[PDB]
Structure formats: C-alpha cells, structure tokens
Ligand binder design. Structure first.
Ligand SMILES: Nc1ncnc2c1ncn2[C@@H]1O[C@H](COP(=O)(O)O)[C@@H](O)[C@H]1O
Ligand SMILES: Nc1ncnc2c1ncn2[C@@H]1O[C@H](COP(=O)(O)O)[C@@H](O)[C@H]1O
Lengths: 209, 209
C-alpha cells in the first residue's frame, strides 16, 4: 500500500473527525466500532485508516507506520511531539487537563503524591507552581485514586466535570485546554506532500467555521 | 472502612475469581461490568472490591490502597513484584507470553525492534537469547504492529492463538506460561492477617481441585 495511512482512535476522535474526512472526500466503508478489523479502507483508494488506542496514535505516526494522525493535545504533551509535525488544531474532542481531589479536603503539608496517567504533564505543571511532586503512574479510572487514598490529587482530562462530581471530587486547578490535533510523520510530510496537501487544505477550510 | 479491600480487573479475572470468593463467603451484590461504580460492597461487610485496569492492580496493592489483589503473571512481571507478596498461583486466566510475527517472514539481520506492551519482559527474554533489542512501547492491539511494519516482532499474551491467525501472524517463541496470582500488601499481610487468613486458606483449598 503506497498511499496514505491515517491513524485514529475510537469514540470522540473518530466521531468528530469523520465529517472533516467526508468533506475531504474520505468515507469509511463500515463502522470500525463494530469490527475486529484494524486496517480499514475508505472511499478514496489512496487513503486507509488505522484505529488505535489514543495513546498509540503519536507512536505509529512518529515511526511512519501511519503517515498522519489525529491525536489529543493531552496525549501529545505526555508522549512528546518532537518527532512529528503538529499541523492543525482541529478544535474537536475539546476538554481540559485539570488537577482534582476530594471535595474540601485539605492538602497535606508535605511533598504531594499525584495519581495520574499524565506523569510528564503532572510533573511539568507542578514544577511551574514551585512543587516537586511524586507521581503514581496509573492507566485508567483516576477518580478512584483519591477515594482510597492513593495519592493526594489526580491529574486528568475533564469535559463536563460529571465524573468528578459523581465521585465527590472537585477540580482544584485548570492546567490547559485540550483539543485534537493533526500530526504528520516528518518524512511523509516531505515524500507524500502531493497526497497530503489537498486533505490538509480541506481540513483547514472546514475548521474555519 | 477498616476491613479488607480486594483489587480485581474486568473480564476473565473477575469471572474466574468469583467462584473462589463465593466459596470463601464473598459475593458481589451486583454485576460490576454493568456499573459506573468503582468501589463495590460484598455479602461480607469486612470485604469490598475495587475494579481496576489489570495494569493498575499491582500498583494499588503495593501502595496499600487495596490490601490484596488478583493480577496476571504477565502484569506482575512487567510491573515488578518486589514490593508485594505473591501468595498463590490461582491457576486462572491461563495464557502464554509469546513472541510473534508475520507468517513465514524472515528476521532482518540487524538489531530487532519489538513492538509490545511488555517492554521489560521483551528486553529480559531477548537478553536470554543473546539479543539486545529495541522496544517500541504500545498500549493495545499489538497484532497490527507487524502488518504496518511497526517493529519486526511483537511480544504479547496468547490464549487460543486466534487473534494471531486472524491477522496472518504466527507465534515464533514461547516465553512463559501466565496465570493469575494472589498478591498482598506487605503491611496488610502483617496488620490484617486475621482477616486475610481464612480467605487465603479457602482459596488454597479451592485451587486444590
Ligand atoms: N476530550 C476528551 N478526550 C478524552 N477523554 C475525555 C475527553 N473528555 C472527557 N474525557 C474523559 O471521559 C470521562 C468523562 O468526562 P467528564 O465529561 O468530565 O465527566 C472522564 O473519564 C474523562 O477523563
Ligand atoms: N489470560 C489472558 N489475560 C489477558 N489477556 C488475554 C489472556 N488470554 C488472551 N488474552 C488477550 O485476549 C485476546 C485473545 O487472545 P487469543 O485467544 O490468543 O486470540 C488477545 O488480544 C490476547 O492478548
């Protein structure tokens, strides 16, 4: 396969990317959510889609196993974006990285323990606040950690805040806003520009409203 | 809450642990798979259950946010088991860590690139074969990596082999057998032994057939 390989993830990113792709003349021929398949053809025979864990999107793109991809800023910040090109803020799958803890609980007067998936983001943010912190690396369900005393705060993505509230937690600090971003393999950008360019211009045009 | 907190994961581990718990007089009062809840009470008011990512099970137990837990040997090996006590091989959720690649594809004559979730296990295994390898860290769907040329082999857990076959991959090497294990917090073992002991003896008795 000699065309372009696009790396996406399930849920919000796939949902919200699909209209951008359609306007660029790319449509999936089935629902990837309902399939065990991994590589998907599209209406354009120069473009195929990988469905990955959101976490693996920047990895596949960096190594050139995908030519380009849609990844959240949270994931890009955590992974490091030094070896891909961020070309667009797609303004989709919008949320915030926040810190949070048990509602009205006081912070202990000592080095804080941060339970999070976003270990690099947690360390960098607390460094900006004057705090060297310990991080407990986790993989899901951060909202449980403070309820069983695993760490003093969490760092996680928050959209509505309903998860936090449901668990008697509240956001303490806003870290940054997060949205999905168009990333490109640094070599594919050079070698496959004529394939990429009309799709990038289409996306840019679509985002302009 | 002053009793015992048991850390489990969804799917196979929960399914297969449940009969051991029942025989020990512990039954969940609802299906955790059908709930957004995180902490679950049981029929025994001294025992509650956390439902975690399999990856977070050893973490919660190490830090004492759970007193004990059921984790797969694959996860224990990857995480490191130096700060919990492995008390039982439960002989459940049985599978193998294997290496695998594209069917009949030759290995390149150079330093191999291993796409895997199990970076430590991959490095340790290939070291035993005389190979220093590069590892590409991934989070799911390892069976895609060799189909798009991300690395030369994968390391992953294999049960039936159907996933590998479905994707035109084959197991190259058997690394080790994997089963779920009963782990205990090193302090909870000392402080809460009278609570733990009858549950451990029950599990030991059940496994004996
Ligand atoms: N844009 C997003 N990308 C990824 N995960 C998200 C996003 N927005 C919310 N989440 C997660 O989805 C769940 C629901 O978020 P919330 O609406 O804040 O309760 C939480 O576990 C969040 O971490
Ligand atoms: N005991 C196990 N624990 C966790 N994951 C497993 C286990 N057995 C199989 N899997 C995974 O489940 C899928 C089905 O495995 P298989 O039956 O080998 O096709 C693969 O993605 C395996 O990595």
């Amino acid at each position: 396969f000699l065309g372009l390989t696009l790396a996406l993830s399930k849920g919000r990113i796939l949902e919200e990317t699909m209209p951008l792709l359609r306007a660029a003349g790319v449509e999936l021929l089935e629902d990837p959510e309902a399939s065990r398949k991994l590589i998907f053809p599209t209406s354009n025979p120069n473009v195929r889609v990988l469905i990955l864990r959101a976490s693996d999107v920047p990895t596949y793109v960096e190594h050139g196993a995908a030519d380009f991809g849609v990844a959240g800023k949270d994931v890009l910040l955590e992974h490091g974006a030094n070896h891909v090109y961020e070309l667009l803020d797609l303004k989709i799958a919008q949320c915030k990285l926040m810190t949070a803890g048990v509602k009205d609980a006081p912070l202990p007067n000592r080095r804080l323990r941060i339970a999070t998936k976003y270990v690099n983001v947690a360390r960098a943010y607390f460094a900006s606040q004057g705090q060297q912190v310990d991080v407990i690396k986790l993989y899901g369900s951060m909202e449980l950690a403070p309820l069983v005393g695993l760490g003093d705060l969490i760092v996680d993505v928050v959209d509505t805040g309903n998860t936090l509230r449901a668990n008697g937690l509240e956001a303490r600090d806003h870290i940054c806003d997060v949205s999905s971003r168009l990333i490109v393999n640094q070599v594919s950008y050079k070698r496959k520009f004529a394939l990429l360019e009309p799709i990038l211009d289409s996306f840019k045009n679509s985002i302009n409203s």
